[PDB]
Write a structure and sequence with these properties.
With 265 residues, the protein is of the alpha+beta class. It has a single domain, classed as Beta-lactamase, CATH 3.40.710. It is built from nine helices and nine strands. Helix 1 runs antiparallel to helix 9. The chain is globular, with a radius of gyration of 17 Å. It catalyses: a beta-lactam + H2O = a substituted beta-amino acid. This is Beta-lactamase. It comes from Mycobacterium tuberculosis (strain CDC 1551 / Oshkosh). Pfam families: Beta-lactamase2.
Length: 265
């Protein structure tokens, strides 16, 4: 009856909702529109940081990147304050994850190198983790703005969940680089009203949000039960029926997470 409750959420919030929680040794996968495409929005920033960590030695985190005011695009709570000084790769990773900083993301994409300002290389990184579905095609902010139906800049709840599973719980990264990525997601400042809000306080939650036009609101998380049992949770939503100006509904994400927690308890 989990499906009926996710469907009732779609009607309550006038939204399309996508959910995936991978199977574990004791629980079945939870899936709802898990194979439908949704815009990444900022959720891509979490595997982006993984890609940067993966392709360089740790000493690369201290390499300083300089940029100008013309480089500052989209939401940039952090980068604007370090134009004069530049920011290291490590600081950029911190900003991209914990504050969803779009200029930081663009600079990290450029750091991956190659055509499309790093987007082809980013998609290549996802392929190395077995994700054949997702693709990133534009940088911030254009990537939040593709029309419904465009496959560009999309993933599926299923695909992004399996990526996050390998990065945080699996062996995609060595322990030291894995801990840095985990720690930035643990100290995220943007997801209090989403997956975190849907889980009781005694469950640990690390996450990365995404927000966009056409009422787009996403959150991808790893959670741990009060006795330390981990699950990966991907929730994505949009409201295409309202057109470009449709409002994202964070509450819908929090309610879907509560339905999930009830099944995981």
């Amino acid at each position: 009856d989990l499906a009926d409750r996710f469907a009732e959420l779609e009607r309550r919030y006038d939204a399309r909702l996508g959910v995936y929680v991978p199977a574990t040794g004791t629980t079945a996968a939870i899936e709802y529109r898990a194979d439908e495409r949704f815009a990444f929005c900022s959720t891509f920033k979490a595997p982006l940081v993984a890609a940067v960590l993966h392709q360089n030695p740790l000493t690369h985190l201290d390499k300083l990147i300089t940029y100008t005011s013309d480089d500052i695009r989209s939401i940039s709570p952090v980068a604007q304050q370090h134009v004069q000084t530049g920011m290291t790769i490590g600081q950029l990773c911190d900003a991209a994850i914990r504050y969803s900083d779009g200029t930081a993301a663009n600079l990290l994409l450029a750091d991956l190198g190659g055509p499309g300002g790093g987007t082809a290389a980013f998609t290549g990184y996802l392929r190395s983790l077995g994700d054949t579905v997702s693709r990133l095609d534009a940088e911030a902010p254009e990537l939040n703005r593709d029309p419904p139906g465009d496959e560009r800049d999309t993933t599926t709840p299923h695909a992004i969940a399996l990526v996050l599973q390998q990065l945080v719980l699996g062996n995609a990264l060595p322990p030291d680089k894995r801990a840095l990525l985990t720690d930035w997601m643990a100290r995220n400042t943007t997801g209090a009203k989403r997956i975190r809000a849907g889980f009781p306080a005694d469950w640990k939650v690390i996450d990365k949000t995404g927000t966009g036009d056409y009422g787009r609101a996403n959150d991808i998380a790893v959670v741990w039960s009060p006795t330390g049992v981990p699950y990966v949770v991907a929730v994505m939503s949009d409201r295409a029926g309202g057109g470009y100006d449709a409002e994202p509904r964070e509450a819908l994400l929090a309610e879907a997470a509560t339905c999930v927690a009830g099944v995981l308890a």
